[PDB]
């Protein structure tokens, strides 16, 4: 749902998931990179009581 949840997902997990090809993963990485973010980050004590 949130950017915080997506950012923690790694590239391999989002490659193995069904209905998500290489183009969609690349577009996700592109829209993340537009804001200086990347997949594979790690966060502690998430979510903060949404």
């Amino acid at each position: 749902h949130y950017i915080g949840d997506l950012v923690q997902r790694t590239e391999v997990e989002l490659l193995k998931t069904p209905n998500l090809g290489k183009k969609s993963l690349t577009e996700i990485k592109d829209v993340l990179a537009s804001r200086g973010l990347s997949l594979g980050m790690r966060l502690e004590n998430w979510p903060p009581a949404s």
């Binding site: 915080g4 200086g36 973010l37 980050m41 790690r42 966060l43 502690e44 004590n45 998430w46």
Partner: protein, 51 residues
Amino acid sequence: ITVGPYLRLHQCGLPKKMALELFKPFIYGKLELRGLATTIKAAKKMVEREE
């Protein structure tokens, strides 16, 4: 070196400016871990400002 009479045998007294300089990558890692900084440059700026 000065003297500290209140210390225990396993303890020393370290200035916090020296500690801030010596433990810098640990501070970067802990800052990025808990969401305060999203990138390395943000943590660099935060440590520079001494927030």
